[PDB]
Every structure is written in C-alpha cells, then in structure tokens.
C-alpha cells in the first residue's frame, strides 16, 4: 500500500523458477536490477535450486560472499540479484561459465558455455536517442547505456557486447530471415527464423517466426530477440535447439530414450 513491497509469496513467484509449495511461505524477492521481476532468475535460485551447490540460502550467501560468482564479468554478492536473459554467470573457482537462456518450456535452462563464449553477450536495444550535446545513446534490454553506437543500429536490433569493455562488437538488424528467440508469451523459449512482421500503428506489432522444423508461430514484437544473422545463431543453444515438441512427440522421445538407456 504505502511505499514499495519487499516480500514475494512462494506461490506468487514466477512459475518458471519451479519452486515448491511446501518449502516455506516466501520466495526470494529479486532485487532491483537489469531485468524485470518476472523475467529473471535470482542468484539463489540458480546456485541452490538449479546447480545444487547449496542446500540452504545460507550456503548461497556463503558461496556469494567468497566472491566466487560473476554476472557479466562483475562479481555479485547479492544472492537475490536479478539475472536474466543472455547473462553470463561465471564461476572461476569451479571453472564453469553458464549463459542464462530460455528453454522451450519457458524456463531458464542450465546451459554451460565455453570460456571463449563467456567473453561476450547479446543485447536487444530497447531505445536509441540523441542527448547531451548530440551524442547518440542506446539503451539495451539489460539497461546498459552505450554511447556512440553505430548509426545503423536501431530499436529491436541485437548488439554483441564485449563484457570486459561493455562496447559494441557487431550487430544484427531486425529483419526477415534472421534467427531469433521468443522471450515472452506462450511461445517463450522457441527459436526460429523471422518470416513476416505485420505492423499495427498505435498498437503492438506482431512478428511471425518459423521453426527449424517447419513449425510457424507468432509473437508480439516486444517478445522477439534476434539471435543470429540468417539462420546461424551467434551464441550456443540448449540441448533443444528452440524446437518445441508436442506432448505426443515428447512422450515418444522419452519412452524411446528410456527403452534405449535403461
């Protein structure tokens, strides 16, 4: 009511955290940060629920205060730090790098990446504006303000950011035929090639995306994130390649795998 809220009920938490219902009344309320409350993975969820290096939140705090975890190359000690799409989580002590990426079920998968691919990330530019004596500034989906971008870079484009310097390495335009992922809605986590963007002035543009298996879907323009030029992604993809399976196909695959494994 008065002032901001500071708690988050366990059942009111984002469903993609895959939290329980009997492990307490509260869920980790993500801190303010680059990503939204419902589109982020708090560091405690990643280090405890996913990676299982910790059994309690106190162990997550113990891990984080040893400065063992870096998000986008910067050490974070906030166990509720909001880590979201495209963030690089590096643990030099155990020598592993992950990229926070979406699974076809709309959940942040545990996606391991090489030390060479942990040096950069992809950012969707949210706005471009001229300010402060004529300098063009560009704001990204992770609230990274970059001055003097390439004049070709526009809104809805993707820029490769070198994490050490925070500067633009290359960019992919938003165009038909470019690979992209869906970062919101029902099609969250699916990867495909843009086929048609149909504009609605004064309203939300709708972008149509075709899977690598031929399946076609649609999303709002705000939910598109260009992944690569053409059909080659600029970043590594999860075990699934953005191809969402039907429940029947997934059941058949699971049955066949169990038959051939044990």
């Amino acid at each position: 009511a008065r002032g901001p809220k500071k708690h988050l009920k366990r059942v009111a938490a984002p469903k993609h955290w895959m939290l329980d219902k009997l492990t307490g009344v509260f869920a980790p309320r993500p801190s303010t940060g680059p990503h939204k409350l419902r589109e982020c993975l708090p560091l405690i969820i990643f280090l405890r629920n996913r990676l299982k290096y910790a059994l309690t939140g106190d162990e997550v705090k113990k891990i984080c205060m040893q400065r063992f975890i870096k998000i986008d190359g910067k050490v974070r000690t906030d166990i509720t730090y909001p880590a979201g799409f495209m963030d690089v989580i590096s643990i030099d002590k155990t020598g592993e790098n992950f990229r926070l990426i979406y699974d076809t079920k709309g959940r942040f998968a545990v996606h391991r990446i090489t030390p060479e691919e942990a040096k950069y990330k992809l950012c969707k530019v949210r706005k471009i504006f001229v300010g402060t004596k004529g300098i063009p500034h560009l704001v990204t989906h992770d609230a990274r303000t970059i001055r003097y971008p390439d004049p070709l870079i526009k809104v809805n484009d993707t820029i490769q950011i070198d994490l050490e310097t925070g500067k633009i390495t290359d960019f992919i335009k938003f165009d038909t035929g470019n690979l992209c992922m869906v970062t919101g809605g029902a099609n969250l986590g699916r990867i495909g090639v843009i086929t048609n963007r149909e504009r609605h002035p004064g309203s939300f543009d709708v972008v149509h995306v075709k899977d690598a298996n031929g399946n076609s879907f649609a999303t709002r323009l705000s939910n598109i994130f260009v992944i690569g030029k053409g059909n080659k992604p600029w970043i590594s993809l999860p075990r699934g390649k953005g191809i969402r399976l039907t429940i029947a196909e997934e059941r058949d695959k699971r049955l066949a795998a169990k038959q051939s494994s044990g």
């Binding site: 300098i135 001055r147 003097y148 390439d150 004049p151 070709l152």
Partner: peptide, 30 residues
C-alpha cells in the same frame, strides 16, 4: 576516454554518411 570516443564516432559517422551519400547517388542514378 571522452575525447577518444568522440574521435572514433566522428570517423565512424563520416564513413557512414559517405556510404549513405553513395547509396543516395546510386538511387538517383536510376
């Protein structure tokens, strides 16, 4: 850093405007 960034963007803007002018002249060619 401010001076270096301003110089780099000035050169990049000159290159980009030259490319845009070349495209404009090629468009007016048709």
């Amino acid at each position: 850093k401010n001076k270096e960034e301003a110089a780099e963007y000035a050169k990049l803007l000159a290159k980009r405007m030259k490319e845009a002018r070349e495209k404009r002249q090629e468009q007016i060619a048709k």
